[PDB]
Design a protein around this ligand. Structure first.
Ligand code: HEM
Length: 212
């Protein structure tokens, strides 16, 4: 069984749960506020900053290297534009750093520093979702908040070096399936993908509480 299929199948139940967190349910319905949207985007800024520091640390490591696509996929620079948009020119001092975000970041550096063979789990959970459902979420955010089609405020959701998110996804999956893989590694990659999903759920649970 191919890793990209093993992952999708191992995470479908928790994906359904993540979609049905209160925050994402509200989001899906068009009810996101500016405050709530800013909180989630500032959190992703920290998350992707950590993920991408660790992708760089491990770019030459064969347990990750086939998924090294910084130009196409990396989100940090995009999130920086979005922070300047939502929080202003001194965004670096304004943006929050919530404990649930700190928890996700911590685990990202553990994986990247000490278990890099699991990094694929974390890149899968974030990037493949961003290339799929993230596109749906973009439209909803756009309509809810009157964000222009020219893309300001939603750089995160825009992939200017990928023509077609579905074709890229297929490439990325085909490259996932070329990673060296024993049952040990595969079994733990899929466990870690489930933890990645949980760290996202816990962020959303925390954000919802902060907002209400
Ligand atoms: C309301 C919230 C969300 C909606 C509406 C949503 C929607 C979707 C849709 C429609 C797909 C494609 C289904 C398919 O190809 O068969 C998908 C794929 C994906 N989503 Fe989500 N999603 C949501 C939240 C999440 C969250 C919180 C994560 C992860 C943190 C996530 C991660 C993924 C991943 C990794 C994939 C790719 C699955 C695969 O092809 O292996 N999504 N999303």
């Amino acid at each position: 069984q191919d890793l990209s299929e093993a992952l999708k199948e191992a995470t479908k139940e928790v994906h359904i749960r993540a979609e049905n967190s209160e925050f994402m349910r509200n989001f899906q319905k068009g009810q996101v506020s500016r405050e709530g949207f800013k909180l989630v985007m500032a959190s992703l800024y920290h998350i992707y900053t950590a993920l991408e520091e660790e992708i760089e640390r491990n770019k030459q490591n064969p347990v990750y290297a086939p998924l090294y696509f910084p130009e196409e996929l990396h989100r940090r620079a995009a999130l920086e534009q979005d922070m300047a948009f939502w929080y202003g020119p001194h965004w670096q001092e304004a943006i929050p750093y919530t404990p649930a975000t700190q928890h996700y970041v911590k685990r990202l550096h553990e994986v990247g520093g000490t278990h890099p063979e699991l990094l694929v789990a974390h890149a899968y959970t974030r990037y493949l979702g961003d290339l799929s459902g993230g596109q749906v979420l973009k439209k909803i955010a756009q309509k809810a908040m009157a964000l222009p089609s020219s893309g300001e405020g939603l750089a995160f959701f825009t992939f200017p070096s990928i023509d077609n998110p579905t074709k890229f996804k297929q490439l990325y999956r085909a490259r996932m399936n070329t990673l060296e893989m024993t049952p040990e590694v595969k079994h733990r990659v899929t466990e870690e993908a489930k933890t990645a999903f949980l760290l996202n759920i816990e962020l959303f649970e925390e954000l919802q509480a902060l907002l209400t």
